Design a binder for this molecule. Structure first.
Ligand SMILES: O=S1(=O)N[C@@H]2CNC[C@@H]2Oc2ncccc21
Ligand SMILES: O=S1(=O)N[C@@H]2CNC[C@@H]2Oc2ncccc21
Ligand SMILES: O=S1(=O)N[C@@H]2CNC[C@@H]2Oc2ncccc21
Ligand SMILES: O=S1(=O)N[C@@H]2CNC[C@@H]2Oc2ncccc21
Ligand SMILES: O=S1(=O)N[C@@H]2CNC[C@@H]2Oc2ncccc21
Length: 339
Protein backbone atom coordinates (compact mmCIF):
# COMPACT_ATOMS: atom_id res chain seq x y z
CA UNK A 1 0.00 0.00 0.00
CA UNK A 2 1.44 3.36 -1.07
CA UNK A 3 0.23 5.03 2.12
CA UNK A 4 2.13 2.48 4.23
CA UNK A 5 5.31 2.78 2.15
CA UNK A 6 5.29 6.58 2.27
CA UNK A 7 4.59 6.43 6.00
CA UNK A 8 7.51 4.13 6.76
CA UNK A 9 9.82 6.10 4.46
CA UNK A 10 9.07 9.32 6.32
CA UNK A 11 9.33 7.49 9.64
CA UNK A 12 12.85 6.35 8.78
CA UNK A 13 13.88 9.81 7.56
CA UNK A 14 12.72 11.40 10.79
CA UNK A 15 14.32 8.68 12.93
CA UNK A 16 17.65 8.97 11.13
CA UNK A 17 17.82 12.74 11.61
CA UNK A 18 17.53 12.36 15.39
CA UNK A 19 19.64 9.17 15.44
CA UNK A 20 22.57 10.98 13.86
CA UNK A 21 22.32 14.03 16.17
CA UNK A 22 21.06 12.82 19.55
CA UNK A 23 19.85 15.20 22.21
CA UNK A 24 21.73 15.28 25.53
CA UNK A 25 21.50 17.02 28.89
CA UNK A 26 18.01 18.49 28.67
CA UNK A 27 17.20 18.77 32.46
CA UNK A 28 18.72 18.05 35.89
CA UNK A 29 17.67 16.12 38.99
CA UNK A 30 16.79 19.11 41.16
CA UNK A 31 14.23 20.24 38.56
CA UNK A 32 12.03 17.42 39.91
CA UNK A 33 10.39 16.29 43.13
CA UNK A 34 10.61 12.56 43.78
CA UNK A 35 7.19 11.01 44.51
CA UNK A 36 7.41 7.19 44.55
CA UNK A 37 9.41 4.24 43.24
CA UNK A 38 7.39 2.56 40.47
CA UNK A 39 9.81 -0.34 39.92
CA UNK A 40 13.31 -1.52 40.73
CA UNK A 41 15.97 -3.76 39.21
CA UNK A 42 19.63 -4.73 39.39
CA UNK A 43 21.17 -1.51 38.00
CA UNK A 44 18.36 1.03 38.24
CA UNK A 45 14.82 1.95 39.13
CA UNK A 46 11.95 4.00 37.77
CA UNK A 47 10.46 6.74 39.95
CA UNK A 48 7.39 8.90 39.59
CA UNK A 49 8.59 12.51 39.68
CA UNK A 50 6.92 15.89 39.36
CA UNK A 51 8.60 18.70 37.47
CA UNK A 52 8.75 21.66 39.84
CA UNK A 53 8.12 24.44 37.35
CA UNK A 54 5.37 22.89 35.24
CA UNK A 55 3.73 20.48 37.66
CA UNK A 56 3.88 17.71 35.06
CA UNK A 57 4.44 14.15 36.17
CA UNK A 58 7.02 11.90 34.57
CA UNK A 59 8.49 8.43 34.97
CA UNK A 60 12.21 8.87 35.66
CA UNK A 61 14.43 5.87 34.97
CA UNK A 62 17.62 6.21 37.04
CA UNK A 63 20.60 4.02 36.20
CA UNK A 64 23.61 3.74 38.50
CA UNK A 65 26.63 4.17 36.22
CA UNK A 66 28.86 1.96 38.35
CA UNK A 67 26.29 -0.85 38.38
CA UNK A 68 25.75 -0.49 34.64
CA UNK A 69 29.50 -1.00 34.16
CA UNK A 70 29.65 -3.95 36.55
CA UNK A 71 26.73 -5.73 34.87
CA UNK A 72 28.21 -5.10 31.38
CA UNK A 73 25.28 -2.96 30.23
CA UNK A 74 27.15 0.13 28.92
CA UNK A 75 26.39 -0.48 25.24
CA UNK A 76 22.79 -1.48 26.01
CA UNK A 77 22.23 1.68 28.05
CA UNK A 78 23.66 3.85 25.28
CA UNK A 79 21.43 2.03 22.76
CA UNK A 80 18.37 2.61 24.95
CA UNK A 81 18.74 6.36 25.27
CA UNK A 82 19.84 6.91 21.66
CA UNK A 83 16.88 4.94 20.30
CA UNK A 84 14.32 6.46 22.66
CA UNK A 85 15.31 10.00 21.80
CA UNK A 86 14.97 9.20 18.06
CA UNK A 87 11.69 7.21 17.80
CA UNK A 88 8.14 8.51 17.48
CA UNK A 89 5.14 6.19 17.30
CA UNK A 90 1.73 6.22 19.04
CA UNK A 91 2.46 3.16 21.16
CA UNK A 92 6.03 3.99 22.21
CA UNK A 93 6.78 5.82 25.44
CA UNK A 94 7.99 9.35 24.80
CA UNK A 95 11.37 10.35 26.21
CA UNK A 96 10.98 13.92 27.48
CA UNK A 97 14.39 14.64 29.03
CA UNK A 98 17.69 12.94 29.57
CA UNK A 99 20.74 13.92 31.57
CA UNK A 100 23.48 12.48 33.73
CA UNK A 101 25.33 13.52 36.86
CA UNK A 102 28.27 12.27 38.87
CA UNK A 103 26.54 8.98 39.72
CA UNK A 104 23.55 8.26 37.50
CA UNK A 105 22.01 8.33 34.06
CA UNK A 106 18.46 9.64 33.84
CA UNK A 107 15.77 9.08 31.22
CA UNK A 108 12.63 11.07 32.00
CA UNK A 109 9.67 9.55 30.16
CA UNK A 110 5.95 10.17 29.98
CA UNK A 111 4.19 8.76 33.02
CA UNK A 112 1.49 6.24 32.06
CA UNK A 113 -0.78 5.86 35.12
CA UNK A 114 -2.62 2.70 34.09
CA UNK A 115 0.15 0.37 35.20
CA UNK A 116 1.77 -2.66 33.61
CA UNK A 117 -0.24 -4.99 31.44
CA UNK A 118 1.24 -7.73 33.67
CA UNK A 119 -0.80 -6.51 36.65
CA UNK A 120 -4.07 -6.39 34.76
CA UNK A 121 -3.49 -9.77 33.12
CA UNK A 122 -2.73 -11.47 36.41
CA UNK A 123 -5.68 -9.72 38.08
CA UNK A 124 -8.24 -10.59 35.34
CA UNK A 125 -6.64 -14.01 34.78
CA UNK A 126 -6.66 -14.01 31.00
CA UNK A 127 -7.80 -11.60 28.31
CA UNK A 128 -10.58 -12.53 25.90
CA UNK A 129 -9.38 -12.95 22.31
CA UNK A 130 -10.74 -9.54 21.23
CA UNK A 131 -8.94 -7.93 24.18
CA UNK A 132 -5.67 -9.76 23.47
CA UNK A 133 -6.08 -8.93 19.75
CA UNK A 134 -6.48 -5.20 20.47
CA UNK A 135 -3.12 -5.19 22.29
CA UNK A 136 -1.49 -7.52 19.79
CA UNK A 137 -2.41 -5.24 16.87
CA UNK A 138 -0.64 -2.37 18.57
CA UNK A 139 2.47 -4.51 19.00
CA UNK A 140 2.29 -5.61 15.35
CA UNK A 141 2.20 -1.98 14.21
CA UNK A 142 4.95 -1.00 16.66
CA UNK A 143 7.24 -3.79 15.43
CA UNK A 144 6.50 -2.91 11.82
CA UNK A 145 7.67 0.61 12.70
CA UNK A 146 10.75 -0.43 14.73
CA UNK A 147 11.90 -3.10 12.27
CA UNK A 148 11.59 -0.68 9.35
CA UNK A 149 14.17 1.47 11.22
CA UNK A 150 16.46 -1.60 11.53
CA UNK A 151 15.66 -1.75 15.27
CA UNK A 152 15.17 -5.02 17.15
CA UNK A 153 13.25 -4.62 20.41
CA UNK A 154 14.23 -7.80 22.31
CA UNK A 155 12.26 -7.30 25.52
CA UNK A 156 8.60 -7.92 24.73
CA UNK A 157 6.74 -9.18 27.81
CA UNK A 158 3.68 -8.01 29.77
CA UNK A 159 5.65 -6.06 32.36
CA UNK A 160 7.09 -3.83 29.61
CA UNK A 161 3.72 -2.79 28.20
CA UNK A 162 1.97 -0.04 30.12
CA UNK A 163 -1.73 0.73 29.74
CA UNK A 164 -2.52 4.39 29.19
CA UNK A 165 -5.48 6.59 30.05
CA UNK A 166 -7.21 5.60 26.77
CA UNK A 167 -6.58 1.89 27.36
CA UNK A 168 -3.88 1.70 24.69
CA UNK A 169 -0.39 0.21 25.05
CA UNK A 170 2.77 2.18 25.68
CA UNK A 171 5.90 0.11 25.13
CA UNK A 172 8.51 1.00 27.71
CA UNK A 173 11.96 -0.32 28.40
CA UNK A 174 14.28 -0.08 25.44
CA UNK A 175 17.11 -1.51 27.53
CA UNK A 176 17.78 -4.30 25.02
CA UNK A 177 16.74 -2.51 21.84
CA UNK A 178 19.46 -2.28 19.20
CA UNK A 179 19.91 -0.94 15.71
CA UNK A 180 20.98 -3.98 13.68
CA UNK A 181 21.27 -4.41 9.95
CA UNK A 182 21.29 -8.18 9.67
CA UNK A 183 22.14 -10.31 12.68
CA UNK A 184 23.12 -9.76 16.28
CA UNK A 185 24.38 -12.13 18.97
CA UNK A 186 23.83 -10.93 22.54
CA UNK A 187 22.09 -13.24 24.97
CA UNK A 188 19.50 -10.97 26.51
CA UNK A 189 15.82 -10.98 27.33
CA UNK A 190 13.61 -12.92 29.67
CA UNK A 191 13.79 -16.73 29.39
CA UNK A 192 10.08 -17.35 28.78
CA UNK A 193 10.15 -14.97 25.80
CA UNK A 194 13.41 -16.04 24.10
CA UNK A 195 13.31 -17.44 20.59
CA UNK A 196 15.13 -20.75 19.99
CA UNK A 197 17.88 -19.07 17.97
CA UNK A 198 18.77 -16.90 21.00
CA UNK A 199 18.88 -19.97 23.26
CA UNK A 200 21.09 -21.78 20.72
CA UNK A 201 23.59 -18.88 20.59
CA UNK A 202 23.01 -18.16 16.91
CA UNK A 203 23.23 -14.90 15.03
CA UNK A 204 19.62 -13.77 15.14
CA UNK A 205 17.47 -11.03 13.66
CA UNK A 206 14.10 -9.31 13.99
CA UNK A 207 12.35 -12.69 13.80
CA UNK A 208 13.00 -13.00 17.55
CA UNK A 209 10.52 -10.14 18.13
CA UNK A 210 7.85 -12.03 16.17
CA UNK A 211 8.51 -15.15 18.24
CA UNK A 212 8.11 -13.04 21.37
CA UNK A 213 4.81 -11.72 19.99
CA UNK A 214 3.65 -15.33 19.74
CA UNK A 215 4.59 -15.88 23.38
CA UNK A 216 2.84 -12.65 24.41
CA UNK A 217 -0.37 -13.44 22.55
CA UNK A 218 -0.41 -16.95 24.02
CA UNK A 219 0.16 -15.52 27.51
CA UNK A 220 -2.52 -12.84 27.11
CA UNK A 221 -5.10 -15.36 25.89
CA UNK A 222 -4.21 -18.26 28.23
CA UNK A 223 -3.09 -16.33 31.30
CA UNK A 224 0.31 -18.07 31.39
CA UNK A 225 3.13 -18.33 28.86
CA UNK A 226 3.56 -21.40 26.66
CA UNK A 227 6.98 -22.42 28.01
CA UNK A 228 7.52 -22.27 31.77
CA UNK A 229 9.48 -24.12 34.46
CA UNK A 230 11.41 -23.41 37.63
CA UNK A 231 14.81 -23.66 36.01
CA UNK A 232 15.71 -21.63 32.91
CA UNK A 233 17.39 -24.69 31.37
CA UNK A 234 14.03 -26.50 31.50
CA UNK A 235 12.36 -23.50 29.85
CA UNK A 236 15.01 -23.57 27.14
CA UNK A 237 14.45 -27.29 26.45
CA UNK A 238 10.73 -26.63 25.96
CA UNK A 239 11.38 -23.63 23.71
CA UNK A 240 13.70 -25.48 21.35
CA UNK A 241 11.52 -28.63 21.20
CA UNK A 242 8.96 -27.40 18.65
CA UNK A 243 6.10 -28.43 20.97
CA UNK A 244 3.31 -26.13 22.21
CA UNK A 245 0.01 -27.17 23.82
CA UNK A 246 -2.95 -24.87 23.42
CA UNK A 247 -5.91 -24.49 25.77
CA UNK A 248 -9.09 -25.86 24.25
CA UNK A 249 -10.71 -22.46 24.64
CA UNK A 250 -8.35 -20.99 22.04
CA UNK A 251 -10.02 -20.40 18.70
CA UNK A 252 -8.74 -22.37 15.74
CA UNK A 253 -7.59 -19.09 14.14
CA UNK A 254 -5.58 -18.22 17.27
CA UNK A 255 -3.92 -21.63 17.31
CA UNK A 256 -3.01 -21.28 13.65
CA UNK A 257 -1.48 -17.82 14.12
CA UNK A 258 0.48 -19.02 17.14
CA UNK A 259 1.88 -22.07 15.33
CA UNK A 260 3.24 -19.67 12.72
CA UNK A 261 4.70 -17.14 15.21
CA UNK A 262 6.02 -19.90 17.52
CA UNK A 263 7.75 -21.52 14.57
CA UNK A 264 11.13 -22.82 15.76
CA UNK A 265 12.65 -22.48 12.29
CA UNK A 266 13.19 -18.75 11.94
CA UNK A 267 13.17 -18.99 8.13
CA UNK A 268 9.52 -20.15 8.29
CA UNK A 269 8.30 -17.84 11.05
CA UNK A 270 5.55 -15.31 10.35
CA UNK A 271 6.95 -11.82 10.24
CA UNK A 272 10.19 -13.13 8.70
CA UNK A 273 8.88 -14.38 5.34
CA UNK A 274 8.84 -12.61 1.96
CA UNK A 275 5.60 -10.77 2.85
CA UNK A 276 6.95 -9.64 6.21
CA UNK A 277 4.41 -8.18 8.59
CA UNK A 278 1.57 -8.62 6.11
CA UNK A 279 1.42 -12.37 6.77
CA UNK A 280 0.43 -11.38 10.29
CA UNK A 281 -1.85 -8.46 9.45
CA UNK A 282 -3.76 -10.59 6.89
CA UNK A 283 -4.07 -13.66 9.10
CA UNK A 284 -7.63 -14.78 9.88
CA UNK A 285 -7.19 -14.08 13.60
CA UNK A 286 -6.87 -10.38 12.74
CA UNK A 287 -9.81 -10.37 10.31
CA UNK A 288 -11.82 -8.00 12.53
CA UNK A 289 -8.89 -5.60 13.06
CA UNK A 290 -9.03 -2.17 11.45
CA UNK A 291 -5.31 -1.48 11.28
CA UNK A 292 -5.70 2.20 10.42
CA UNK A 293 -8.25 2.77 13.19
CA UNK A 294 -5.87 1.17 15.69
CA UNK A 295 -2.99 3.37 14.55
CA UNK A 296 -5.20 6.48 14.69
CA UNK A 297 -6.40 5.43 18.18
CA UNK A 298 -10.04 5.51 17.09
CA UNK A 299 -11.01 2.07 18.48
CA UNK A 300 -12.64 2.01 21.91
CA UNK A 301 -10.32 0.05 24.18
CA UNK A 302 -11.62 -3.12 25.84
CA UNK A 303 -10.51 -1.82 29.20
CA UNK A 304 -9.73 1.60 30.75
CA UNK A 305 -7.57 1.38 33.90
CA UNK A 306 -9.05 2.94 37.04
CA UNK A 307 -7.01 5.86 38.35
CA UNK A 308 -7.77 9.23 39.90
CA UNK A 309 -5.44 11.59 38.06
CA UNK A 310 -2.10 12.16 36.37
CA UNK A 311 -0.15 11.51 39.56
CA UNK A 312 -2.09 8.47 40.79
CA UNK A 313 0.23 5.51 41.50
CA UNK A 314 -2.49 3.06 42.57
CA UNK A 315 -1.85 0.77 39.58
CA UNK A 316 1.80 0.33 40.51
CA UNK A 317 3.05 -1.61 43.47
CA UNK A 318 5.06 -0.73 46.55
CA UNK A 319 8.84 -0.90 46.78
CA UNK A 320 11.27 0.08 49.49
CA UNK A 321 12.05 3.76 49.04
CA UNK A 322 15.81 4.27 48.70
CA UNK A 323 17.94 7.41 48.38
CA UNK A 324 18.93 8.83 44.99
CA UNK A 325 22.57 9.52 45.83
CA UNK A 326 24.77 11.68 43.68
CA UNK A 327 28.44 11.27 44.50
CA UNK A 328 30.61 14.29 45.15
CA UNK A 329 32.98 12.78 42.55
CA UNK A 330 32.26 11.89 38.94
CA UNK A 331 32.00 8.14 38.30
CA UNK A 332 32.56 6.45 34.94
CA UNK A 333 32.62 9.73 33.04
CA UNK A 334 34.56 8.33 30.10
CA UNK A 335 32.25 5.33 29.65
CA UNK A 336 29.14 7.51 29.37
CA UNK A 337 30.56 10.47 27.40
CA UNK A 338 27.98 10.01 24.63
CA UNK A 339 24.96 9.83 26.97
O1 LIG B 1 6.48 0.43 36.53
S1 LIG B 1 7.75 0.26 35.84
O2 LIG B 1 8.97 0.20 36.64
N1 LIG B 1 7.62 -1.24 35.09
C1 LIG B 1 8.60 -1.82 34.14
C2 LIG B 1 9.91 -2.16 34.85
N2 LIG B 1 10.98 -1.81 33.90
C3 LIG B 1 10.29 -1.75 32.60
C4 LIG B 1 9.05 -0.94 32.96
O3 LIG B 1 9.63 0.30 33.39
C5 LIG B 1 8.78 1.36 33.59
N3 LIG B 1 8.89 2.37 32.65
C6 LIG B 1 8.10 3.49 32.76
C7 LIG B 1 7.24 3.64 33.77
C8 LIG B 1 7.14 2.58 34.75
C9 LIG B 1 7.92 1.48 34.63
O1 LIG C 1 17.42 -2.18 36.87
S1 LIG C 1 16.61 -1.63 35.78
O2 LIG C 1 16.91 -0.31 35.27
N1 LIG C 1 16.86 -2.71 34.51
C1 LIG C 1 16.96 -4.14 34.89
C2 LIG C 1 15.76 -4.54 35.77
O3 LIG C 1 14.55 -3.94 35.29
C3 LIG C 1 14.14 -2.79 35.95
N2 LIG C 1 12.80 -2.78 36.33
C4 LIG C 1 12.29 -1.68 36.98
C5 LIG C 1 13.04 -0.61 37.24
C6 LIG C 1 14.43 -0.64 36.83
C7 LIG C 1 14.94 -1.72 36.21
O1 LIG D 1 -4.12 8.10 26.24
S1 LIG D 1 -3.41 9.30 25.85
O2 LIG D 1 -3.64 10.53 26.58
N1 LIG D 1 -1.77 9.06 26.19
C1 LIG D 1 -0.94 8.14 25.39
C2 LIG D 1 0.50 8.24 25.90
N2 LIG D 1 1.15 9.17 24.97
C3 LIG D 1 0.67 8.70 23.66
C4 LIG D 1 -0.83 8.53 23.90
O3 LIG D 1 -1.35 9.83 23.68
C5 LIG D 1 -2.67 9.84 23.31
N3 LIG D 1 -2.91 10.12 21.97
C6 LIG D 1 -4.20 10.16 21.50
C7 LIG D 1 -5.24 9.95 22.33
C8 LIG D 1 -4.95 9.68 23.72
C9 LIG D 1 -3.68 9.63 24.17
O1 LIG E 1 30.60 -7.71 27.44
S1 LIG E 1 30.42 -7.79 26.00
O2 LIG E 1 30.58 -9.07 25.32
N1 LIG E 1 28.80 -7.32 25.76
C1 LIG E 1 28.20 -7.09 24.41
C2 LIG E 1 28.10 -8.39 23.63
N2 LIG E 1 28.28 -8.03 22.21
C3 LIG E 1 28.25 -6.57 22.16
C4 LIG E 1 29.00 -6.20 23.45
O3 LIG E 1 30.33 -6.66 23.21
C5 LIG E 1 31.32 -6.19 24.03
N3 LIG E 1 32.20 -5.26 23.49
C6 LIG E 1 33.24 -4.76 24.23
C7 LIG E 1 33.43 -5.17 25.49
C8 LIG E 1 32.51 -6.15 26.04
C9 LIG E 1 31.49 -6.63 25.29
O1 LIG F 1 -6.54 12.65 34.66
S1 LIG F 1 -6.58 12.51 33.21
O2 LIG F 1 -7.12 11.30 32.63
N1 LIG F 1 -7.59 13.75 32.65
C1 LIG F 1 -7.12 15.12 32.98
C2 LIG F 1 -8.25 16.16 32.90
N2 LIG F 1 -7.75 17.27 32.07
C3 LIG F 1 -6.68 16.73 31.21
C4 LIG F 1 -6.01 15.61 32.03
O3 LIG F 1 -5.62 14.56 31.14
C5 LIG F 1 -4.68 13.72 31.70
N3 LIG F 1 -3.37 13.88 31.26
C6 LIG F 1 -2.36 13.08 31.76
C7 LIG F 1 -2.62 12.13 32.67
C8 LIG F 1 -3.99 11.98 33.12
C9 LIG F 1 -4.97 12.77 32.62
Amino acid sequence: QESVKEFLAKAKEEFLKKWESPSQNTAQLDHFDRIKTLGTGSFGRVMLVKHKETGNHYAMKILDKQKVVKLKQIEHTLNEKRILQAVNFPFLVKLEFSFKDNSNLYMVMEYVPGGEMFSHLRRIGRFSEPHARFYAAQIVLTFEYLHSLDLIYRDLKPENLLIDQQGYIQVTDFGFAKRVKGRTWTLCGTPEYLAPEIILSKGYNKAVDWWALGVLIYEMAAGYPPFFADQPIQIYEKIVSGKVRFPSHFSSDLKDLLRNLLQVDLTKRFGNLKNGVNDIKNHKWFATTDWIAIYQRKVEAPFIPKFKGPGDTSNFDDYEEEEIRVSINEKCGKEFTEF
